[PDB]
mmCIF file with all atom_site columns, C-alpha atoms in Angstrom:
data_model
loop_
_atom_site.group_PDB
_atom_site.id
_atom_site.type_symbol
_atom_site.label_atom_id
_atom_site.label_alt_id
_atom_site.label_comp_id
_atom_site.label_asym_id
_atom_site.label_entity_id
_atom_site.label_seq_id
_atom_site.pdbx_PDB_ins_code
_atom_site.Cartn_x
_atom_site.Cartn_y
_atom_site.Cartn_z
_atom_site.occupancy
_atom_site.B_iso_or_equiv
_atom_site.pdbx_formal_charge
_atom_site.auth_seq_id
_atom_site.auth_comp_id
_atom_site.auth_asym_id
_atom_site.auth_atom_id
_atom_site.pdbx_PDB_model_num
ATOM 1  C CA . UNK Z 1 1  ? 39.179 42.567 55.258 1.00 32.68 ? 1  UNK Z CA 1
ATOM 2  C CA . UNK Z 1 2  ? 37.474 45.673 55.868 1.00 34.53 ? 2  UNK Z CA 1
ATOM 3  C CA . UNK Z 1 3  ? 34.303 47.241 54.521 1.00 39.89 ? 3  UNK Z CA 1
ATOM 4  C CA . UNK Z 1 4  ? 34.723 48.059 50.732 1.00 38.49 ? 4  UNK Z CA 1
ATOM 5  C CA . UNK Z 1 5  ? 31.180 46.799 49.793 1.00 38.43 ? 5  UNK Z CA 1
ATOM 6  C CA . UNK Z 1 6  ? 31.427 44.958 46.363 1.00 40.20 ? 6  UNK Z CA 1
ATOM 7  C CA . UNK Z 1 7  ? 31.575 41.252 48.264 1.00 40.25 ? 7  UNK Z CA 1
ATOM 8  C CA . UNK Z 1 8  ? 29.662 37.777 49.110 1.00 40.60 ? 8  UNK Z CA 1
ATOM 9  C CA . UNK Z 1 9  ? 30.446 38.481 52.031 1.00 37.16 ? 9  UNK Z CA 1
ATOM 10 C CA . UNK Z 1 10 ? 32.312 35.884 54.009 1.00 37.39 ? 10 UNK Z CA 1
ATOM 11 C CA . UNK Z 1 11 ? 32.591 36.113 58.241 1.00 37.89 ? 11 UNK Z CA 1
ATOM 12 C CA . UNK Z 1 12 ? 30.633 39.346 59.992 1.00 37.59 ? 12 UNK Z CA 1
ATOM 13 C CA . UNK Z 1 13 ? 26.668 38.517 60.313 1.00 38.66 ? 13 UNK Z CA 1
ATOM 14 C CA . UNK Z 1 14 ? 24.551 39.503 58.049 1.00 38.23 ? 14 UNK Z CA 1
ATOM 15 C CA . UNK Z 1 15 ? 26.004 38.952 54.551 1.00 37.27 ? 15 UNK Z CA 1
ATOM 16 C CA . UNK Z 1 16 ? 25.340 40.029 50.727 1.00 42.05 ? 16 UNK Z CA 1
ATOM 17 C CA . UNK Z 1 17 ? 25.322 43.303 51.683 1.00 42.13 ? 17 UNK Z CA 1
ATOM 18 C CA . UNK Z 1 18 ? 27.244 42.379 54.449 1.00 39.99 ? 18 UNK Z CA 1
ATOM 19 C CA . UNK Z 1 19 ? 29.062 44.654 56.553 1.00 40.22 ? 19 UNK Z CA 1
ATOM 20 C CA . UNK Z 1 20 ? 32.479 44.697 57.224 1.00 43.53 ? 20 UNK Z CA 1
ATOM 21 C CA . UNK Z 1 21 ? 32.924 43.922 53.445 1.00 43.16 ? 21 UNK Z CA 1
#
């Protein structure tokens, strides 16, 4: 899992966009 920035996202912070995804 690795910033691709289409995602929820899941695990990193700061999420939907959420860096890295």
């Amino acid at each position: 899992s690795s910033m691709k920035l289409s995602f929820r996202a899941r695990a990193y912070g700061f999420r939907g966009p959420g860096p890295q995804l």
